Design a protein around this nucleic acid. Structure first.
Ligand SMILES: [Mg+2]
Ligand SMILES: [Mg+2]
Ligand SMILES: [Mg+2]
Ligand SMILES: [Mg+2]
Ligand SMILES: [Mg+2]
Ligand SMILES: [Mg+2]
Ligand SMILES: [Mg+2]
Ligand SMILES: [Mg+2]
Ligand SMILES: [Mg+2]
Ligand SMILES: [Mg+2]
Ligand SMILES: [Mg+2]
Ligand SMILES: [Mg+2]
Ligand SMILES: [Mg+2]
Ligand SMILES: [Mg+2]
Ligand SMILES: [Mg+2]
Ligand SMILES: [Mg+2]
Ligand SMILES: [Mg+2]
Ligand SMILES: [Mg+2]
Ligand SMILES: [Mg+2]
Ligand SMILES: [Mg+2]
Ligand SMILES: [Mg+2]
Ligand SMILES: [Mg+2]
Ligand SMILES: [Mg+2]
Ligand SMILES: [Mg+2]
Ligand SMILES: [Mg+2]
Ligand SMILES: [Mg+2]
Ligand SMILES: [Mg+2]
Ligand SMILES: [Mg+2]
Ligand SMILES: [Mg+2]
Ligand SMILES: [Mg+2]
Ligand SMILES: [Mg+2]
Ligand SMILES: [Mg+2]
Ligand SMILES: [Mg+2]
Ligand SMILES: [Mg+2]
Ligand SMILES: [Mg+2]
Ligand SMILES: [Mg+2]
Ligand SMILES: [Mg+2]
Ligand SMILES: [Mg+2]
Ligand SMILES: [Mg+2]
Ligand SMILES: [Mg+2]
Ligand SMILES: [Mg+2]
Ligand SMILES: [Mg+2]
Ligand SMILES: [Mg+2]
Ligand SMILES: [Mg+2]
Ligand SMILES: [Mg+2]
Ligand SMILES: [Mg+2]
Ligand SMILES: [Mg+2]
Ligand SMILES: [Mg+2]
Ligand SMILES: [Mg+2]
Ligand SMILES: [Mg+2]
Ligand SMILES: [Mg+2]
Ligand SMILES: [Mg+2]
Ligand SMILES: [Mg+2]
Ligand SMILES: [Mg+2]
Ligand SMILES: [Mg+2]
Ligand SMILES: [Mg+2]
Ligand SMILES: [Mg+2]
Ligand SMILES: [Mg+2]
Ligand SMILES: [Mg+2]
Ligand SMILES: [Mg+2]
Ligand SMILES: [Mg+2]
Ligand SMILES: [Mg+2]
Ligand SMILES: [Mg+2]
Ligand SMILES: [Mg+2]
Ligand SMILES: [Mg+2]
Ligand SMILES: [Mg+2]
Ligand SMILES: [Mg+2]
Ligand SMILES: [Mg+2]
Ligand SMILES: [Mg+2]
Ligand SMILES: [Mg+2]
Ligand SMILES: [Mg+2]
Ligand SMILES: [Mg+2]
Ligand SMILES: [Mg+2]
Ligand SMILES: [Mg+2]
Ligand SMILES: [Mg+2]
Ligand SMILES: [Mg+2]
Ligand SMILES: [Mg+2]
Ligand SMILES: [Mg+2]
Ligand SMILES: [Mg+2]
Ligand SMILES: [Mg+2]
Ligand SMILES: [Mg+2]
Ligand SMILES: [Mg+2]
Ligand SMILES: [Mg+2]
Ligand SMILES: [Mg+2]
Ligand SMILES: [Mg+2]
Ligand SMILES: [Mg+2]
Ligand SMILES: [Mg+2]
Ligand SMILES: [Mg+2]
Ligand SMILES: [Mg+2]
Ligand SMILES: [Mg+2]
Ligand SMILES: [Zn+2]
Lengths: 48, 60
RNA sequence: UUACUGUUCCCUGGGAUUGGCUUUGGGCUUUUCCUGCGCAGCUUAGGUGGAAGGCGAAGAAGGCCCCCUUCCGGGGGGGCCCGAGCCAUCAGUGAGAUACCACUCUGGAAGAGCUAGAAUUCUAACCUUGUGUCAGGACCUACGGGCCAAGGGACAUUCUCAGGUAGACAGUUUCUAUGGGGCGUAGGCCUCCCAAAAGGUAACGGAGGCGUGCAAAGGUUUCCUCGGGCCGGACGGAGAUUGGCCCUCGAGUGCAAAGGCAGAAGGGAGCUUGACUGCAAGACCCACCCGUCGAGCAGGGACGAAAGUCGGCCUUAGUGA
RNA sequence: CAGUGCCGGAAGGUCAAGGAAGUUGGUGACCUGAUGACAGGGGAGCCGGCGACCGAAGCCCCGGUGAACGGCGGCCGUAACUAUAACGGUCCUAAGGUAGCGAAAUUCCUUGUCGGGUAAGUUCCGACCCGCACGAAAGGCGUAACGAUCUGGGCACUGUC
RNA sequence: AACCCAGAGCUAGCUGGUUCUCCCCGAAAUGCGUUGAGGCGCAGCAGUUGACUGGACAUCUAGGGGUAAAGCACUGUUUCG
RNA sequence: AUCCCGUGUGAAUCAGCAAGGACCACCUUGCAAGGCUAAAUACUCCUGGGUGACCGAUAGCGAAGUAGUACCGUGAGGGA
RNA sequence: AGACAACCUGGCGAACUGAAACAUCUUAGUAGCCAGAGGAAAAGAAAGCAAAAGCGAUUCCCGUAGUAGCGGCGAGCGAA
């Protein structure tokens, strides 16, 4: 139907460009999260 | 084309659903030559509801 | 095959697979600022409210100039110079002071915000290669597996939805009588003839029309008589308007033809809407389906002094289950 | 280069799914009406219709392209005698058949007319052009060689006669 | 647009065929509609069954009509004067 | 409506959720997104009994004897 | 693991035909093919019916009923 921007809320475990310092809270697109951050150990998807 | 089906309608008829015995909006139908007579036709004609000879005008 | 209905190849948009940074930019904004020639006039009257208080040395009136809008009437505004004023019911005006202040409208601006669209990159998805390199008892320059690299890259591919589009493909349709060929023509209704003095009746027999028209060409009350000869009269003539005698139905009647119709159904005038609602004994015509006529009754009217007439039209075509 | 196809073009019109400002309806906590056996308005929610504007290709639009589909006309009048028409007028088209050929595997009338071959020729050869209805890559016109090709004539030869 | 099998006893408003006896009655080939014309629906005209009926065959009278004949009063047509 | 699937979005837990033929209110009924279960019912390559207004060699099964045989067909198959 | 008449479940799935043509519809989810399992299979323990009165998993028969309905409202299809 209408494209709905997917929003994954995450914590950064290392510092990455444009994102920020280690141990940081953010919200991201699903593609960015699962295809880039997550395989490289860089981020962690959070649902407490 | 130049000759037309025209609808005559009671002017004194209230569509709101009246409280009398017989409710409804009287319309007759007839033909007019829209060239010859551009005057909206007026005709006194009988109305089954109002029970009196009323005046029926036209409709667009 | 430019018959119909579709399918497929193929092209193009949404969605999904699908991400990051940057730009540029169309439509809405979030503070906040620009902006208005009814006339009476201190004069390019913003509507509505708090409304006798405001704006000043965190430095105004007034002249020197820079800019922009422009109905060159004037408006916002930067610099400088200047130094104690621009002010309110002060009277007009539907609406008040440029003393001030709030949500805002006419359009403009700016940094900030949503969504595209667009172009540019980036690399990790995804695609493509590799006698690059590992690998088991031994090979895989035998397909392939892992790693690495190289080139592309959020395109493309694949899926879903949508529009377009190939007789490439599929299913089908393509009347009857012509002269039992093409070809164009004909196919319903109405009138006359054929049709043999009830009605009915065929032929690719003989003649024609209709697919409407009129708010009066309907209703009614009341009055009238057309056409054709001959004669008189300025133009005016064969023929226009007027007068008169003779023939008496030969004219007319929206349109075919037939049958009707002369103090008329033909021509005119006055008033109208019965070109109504509810019906209906009985008849005609009839394979059915349809079609036609209608006395009489009630309501509420039109015309007429009243009697009475009026449910479209002199009748028969003007239609479609 | 009008029609059709194909290619290229991007300004305007048209343009689906889908978005979407915004309106609109049903219900209804409730609020009032009412000498009839009831009725009228209505918050939030839920549900429904409509929907300005955004919305690609394609089509309409503009240009090219015949060894792409195909197409390549009429009417008049005129010259030392009859005649004919180089030359003019007009009409209509996108444009009006050029070179070469032509009674042809194309010619209807038609056994066209002429010439030749035969004692005699509806076939045959050459030429005229009045091409019903040739014509240029559905090629036009030539052409040596070739053909169990089609077609006319001749010598030799024969019971084909 | 192969063959074999199956759907399949496909479908055929078409053509062919449809078997014992006696008794009684007995047509139609017309109209209307039809993608109809060699088919079918209804009507017309069989049979059998009931309900009402009183006719038929003759005889005379009465109605309306516009044919045969006839005619020139109209509409055409036509010859001569 | 109820039911079940492609593509995309995407809830609520009993103060709920679903159903009652668009939909909303009210009331009634029910508890989806985990499984498994006998009988009553269908059938005849057959087995054992029984009956037959069933056949009697052109019949009854194609087949009362080499019968799916002989023969035919490349083969599927046909077939006395 | 293969074999297995019919029945059964799932998967693919026609056409002649009917409609006096045919396209929606019918034929028919039939035949056929493929896969699977059993003596039966499947279904099955209410997110069900019903209607203000009540029922109490599934299957099968009679009936409701050729009813309500569906339908180029045609041919036909047809419940609870
Ligand atoms: Mg998404
Ligand atoms: Mg796509
Ligand atoms: Mg995407
Ligand atoms: Mg790379
Ligand atoms: Mg290798
Ligand atoms: Mg490798
Ligand atoms: Mg790159
Ligand atoms: Mg893509
Ligand atoms: Mg499509
Ligand atoms: Mg075809
Ligand atoms: Mg087509
Ligand atoms: Mg007569
Ligand atoms: Mg008679
Ligand atoms: Mg008669
Ligand atoms: Mg006749
Ligand atoms: Mg009058
Ligand atoms: Mg007349
Ligand atoms: Mg007359
Ligand atoms: Mg009169
Ligand atoms: Mg009367
Ligand atoms: Mg009376
Ligand atoms: Mg009366
Ligand atoms: Mg009076
Ligand atoms: Mg009259
Ligand atoms: Mg062209
Ligand atoms: Mg062109
Ligand atoms: Mg062009
Ligand atoms: Mg193009
Ligand atoms: Mg476009
Ligand atoms: Mg839309
Ligand atoms: Mg909205
Ligand atoms: Mg509302
Ligand atoms: Mg209420
Ligand atoms: Mg309401
Ligand atoms: Mg648009
Ligand atoms: Mg050429
Ligand atoms: Mg010759
Ligand atoms: Mg000849
Ligand atoms: Mg000669
Ligand atoms: Mg010869
Ligand atoms: Mg010659
Ligand atoms: Mg020729
Ligand atoms: Mg030619
Ligand atoms: Mg040629
Ligand atoms: Mg040639
Ligand atoms: Mg050519
Ligand atoms: Mg050649
Ligand atoms: Mg040669
Ligand atoms: Mg050869
Ligand atoms: Mg065949
Ligand atoms: Mg059969
Ligand atoms: Mg069958
Ligand atoms: Mg057939
Ligand atoms: Mg007898
Ligand atoms: Mg007879
Ligand atoms: Mg027939
Ligand atoms: Mg009959
Ligand atoms: Mg009888
Ligand atoms: Mg008489
Ligand atoms: Mg008599
Ligand atoms: Mg008489
Ligand atoms: Mg006579
Ligand atoms: Mg006589
Ligand atoms: Mg006479
Ligand atoms: Mg005479
Ligand atoms: Mg349910
Ligand atoms: Mg139910
Ligand atoms: Mg399904
Ligand atoms: Mg879902
Ligand atoms: Mg939950
Ligand atoms: Mg539901
Ligand atoms: Mg329940
Ligand atoms: Mg549960
Ligand atoms: Mg469920
Ligand atoms: Mg369960
Ligand atoms: Mg089970
Ligand atoms: Mg024997
Ligand atoms: Mg035998
Ligand atoms: Mg014997
Ligand atoms: Mg097995
Ligand atoms: Mg097997
Ligand atoms: Mg078994
Ligand atoms: Mg079919
Ligand atoms: Mg068929
Ligand atoms: Mg049929
Ligand atoms: Mg048929
Ligand atoms: Mg059992
Ligand atoms: Mg079971
Ligand atoms: Mg239980
Ligand atoms: Mg349970
Ligand atoms: Zn009235």
């Amino acid at each position: 139907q209408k494209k709905v921007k997917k929003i994954r809320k995450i914590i950064l475990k290392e510092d990455i460009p444009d994102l920020g310092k280690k141990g940081q809270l953010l919200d991201v697109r699903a593609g960015f999260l699962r295809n880039f951050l997550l395989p490289l150990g860089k981020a962690e998807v959070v649902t407490p | 084309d130049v000759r037309v089906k025209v609808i005559l309608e009671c002017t004194g008829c209230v569509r709101k659903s009246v409280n009398k015995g017989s409710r409804g909006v009287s319309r007759y139908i007839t033909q007019k030559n829209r060239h010859n007579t551009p005057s909206r036709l007026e005709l006194r004609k009988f109305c089954p509801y109002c029970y009196k000879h009323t005046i029926h005008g036209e409709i667009k």
